Amino acid sequence: HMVEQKRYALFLATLDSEFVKKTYGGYHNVFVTTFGDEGEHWDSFRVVSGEFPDEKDLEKYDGFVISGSSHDAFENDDWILKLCDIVKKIDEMKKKILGICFGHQIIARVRGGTVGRAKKGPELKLGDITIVKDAITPGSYFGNEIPDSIAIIKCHQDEVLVLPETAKVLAYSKNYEVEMYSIEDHLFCIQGNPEYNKEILFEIVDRVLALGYVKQEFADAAKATMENRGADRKLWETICKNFLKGRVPTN
Numbered sequence: 603h604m605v606e607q608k609r610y611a612l613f614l615a616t617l618d619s620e621f622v623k624k625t626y627g628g629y630h631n632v633f634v635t636t637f638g639d640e641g642e643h644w645d646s647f648r649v650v651s652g653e654f655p656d657e658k659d660l661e662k663y664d665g666f667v668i669s670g671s672s673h674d675a676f677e678n679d680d681w682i683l684k685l686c687d688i689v690k691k692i693d694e695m696k697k698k699i700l701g702i703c704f705g706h707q708i709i710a711r712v713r714g715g716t717v718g719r720a721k722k723g724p725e726l727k728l729g730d731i732t733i734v735k736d737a738i739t740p741g742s743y744f745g746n747e748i749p750d751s752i753a754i755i756k757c758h759q760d761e762v763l764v765l766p767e768t769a770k771v772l773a774y775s776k777n778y779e780v781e782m783y784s785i786e787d788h789l790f791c792i793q794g795n796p797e798y799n800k801e802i803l804f805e806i807v808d809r810v811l812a813l814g815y816v817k818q819e820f821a822d823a824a825k826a827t828m829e830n831r832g833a834d835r836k837l838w839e840t841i842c843k844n845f846l847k848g849r850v851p852t853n
């Protein structure tokens with residue numbers, strides 16, 4: 603009989619930026635580099651462009667990842683509605699979804715939460731989130747020794763303003779009450795972008811500065827957060843893979 607193949611679906615809620623296309627070949631590659639392991643089959647679907655799996659094919663996937671986006675997760679574009687519908691279906695199937703940034707926000711929306719512009723304003727920087735260690739099982743996604751804090755790239759202007767009643771907050775920060783959360787055993791959401799790196803961040807900063815969206819001094823302060831430190835990238839890959847591939851007991 604056939605071996606059980608491992609299949610993951612990536613919902614690309616962003617187009618490929620010029621820098622990401624040139625440097626990495628696009629976000630598919632970025633996501634697979636971050637979360638993929640040898641021998642898995644990753645299908646991506648450019649949901650932002652209205653490309654979706656068929657509902658009948660959802661069962662073949664072992665897990666789903668929803669990417670970041672420049673779009674607002676509270677908007678009502680047809681593709682966002684369709685994304686919410688398909689996420690609702692996957693959620694009902696109890697299939698694993700890792701939501702990243704926009705994805706974190708979409709899952710919150712589907713489960714009755716509210717997303718909108720953050721009360722304390724946008725973040726574009728390397729930040730640190732405080733872990734709610736009391737909500738985390740030793741030897742689950744976060745390893746045997748749970749960190750007090752994790753460094754992650756932040757690139758967002760919106761947040762979960764109202765958490766679904768079914769969500770457990772796993773991390774917060776001074777300005778954002780919901781930096782990471784889980785719902786049941788199959789939904790896991792991070793507001794930051796574990797897939798980003800210094801090069802991706804700095805290129806966004808440069809571009810948004812050039813557009814006149816932020817001041818030079820803001821751009822400078824954003825970049826300064828990563829001049830001498832990086833995100834906890836290896837730890838994020840471990841956590842996310844632990845969750846997405848059920849590599850450790852559930853939390």
